[PDB]
Amino acid sequence: MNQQKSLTLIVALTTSYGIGRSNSLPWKLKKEISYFKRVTSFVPTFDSFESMNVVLMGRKTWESIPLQFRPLKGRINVVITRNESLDLGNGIHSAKSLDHALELLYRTYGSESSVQINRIFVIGGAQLYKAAMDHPKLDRIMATIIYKDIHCDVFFPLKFRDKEWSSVWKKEKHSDLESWVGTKVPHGKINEDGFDYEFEMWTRDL
């Protein structure tokens, strides 16, 4: 009713868990952003008829996305916001929280609907990551790790890759990565504009 699907989080962070700086991305990765697109837009062909995935984001992230690329094309876009008097959108929903966002969707995209949801993604920011991380339906993390310690002022809320969470978070094999995002993905490090990064998939039991 409120929670049918599992939540998936997608983030890019430095080894020190930094995700932002000056309400921006401390970096510029063309291939990192294309993987983003790919992962969150992908829906099985046979189902490519009826379905769309969901991109849930907080207000600030929405404001950061190049206005030329907003709304995210091909995905159900939902902005999380308390102070929502006049959201701006032509069928771009607003919701006062993740749980409210989940019942909104579950109420709009019902059997009535010609449009049905496939997967649901939390794309940021720090603040929504924090709510997602505590949600009882969050079971997968789509993370891109950057091997540079760039200066950030925004950090990811749980050190999911540290020994302390090793009995809860498990890092899946790459072959498993590709099986889920339904495509061959670069393995090992990619270097761009001097940055060395890598794609990983972390799961947890609920």
Ligand X SMILES: NC(=O)c1ccc[n+]([C@@H]2O[C@H](COP(=O)([O-])OP(=O)(O)OC[C@H]3O[C@@H](n4cnc5c(N)ncnc54)[C@H](OP(=O)(O)O)[C@@H]3O)[C@@H](O)[C@H]2O)c1
Show which residues are catalytic: 25, 32
State how beta strands 138-146 and 76-80 pair: unpaired
Per the annotation, does 128 bind a ligand? yes
3-state class (DSSP) for residue 49? coil
- Regarding 81 and contact with ligand X (CB under 6 A), the answer is yes
Binding segment for ligand X among 77-85, 158-166, 176-184, 197-205 (CB under 6 A)? 77-85
The residue among 66 and 136 lying less far from ligand MTX, judged by its C-beta, is 66
- Judge whether 83 is annotated as a binding position: yes
Distance in angstroms (rounded) separating the CA atoms of residues 109 and 180 = 23
Q: What track of x and - describes contact with ligand MTX for positions 100 through 139 (by CB under 6 A)?
A: -----------------------xx---------------
- Residue 66: both structure tokens together: 């190049």
Q: Give bridge partners of residue 197 from the DSSP assignment.
A: 146, 190
Angle between the N-to-C axes of helices 126-134 and 98-108, in degrees from 0 to 180, rounded to the nearest 10: 80
Q: Give the binding-site size for ligand MTX (rule: CB under 6 A).
A: 19
Count of residues touching ligand X (by CB under 6 A): 27
> 154 touches which of ligand MTX, ligand X, none (CB within 5 to 8 A by kind)?
ligand X
* Whether the Cβ atoms of residue 120 and residue 56 lie closer than 8 Å to each other: yes
Is-contact 146 12, C-beta < 8 A? yes
**For ligand X, which stretch binds (CB under 6 A), given 79-87, 108-116, 158-166, 194-202?**
79-87
Count CB atoms within 10 A of the CB of residue 77: 21
Footprint of ligand MTX on this chain (CB under 6 A)?
Answer: 10-12, 25, 32-34, 36-37, 61, 64-66, 69, 72-73, 123-124, 144
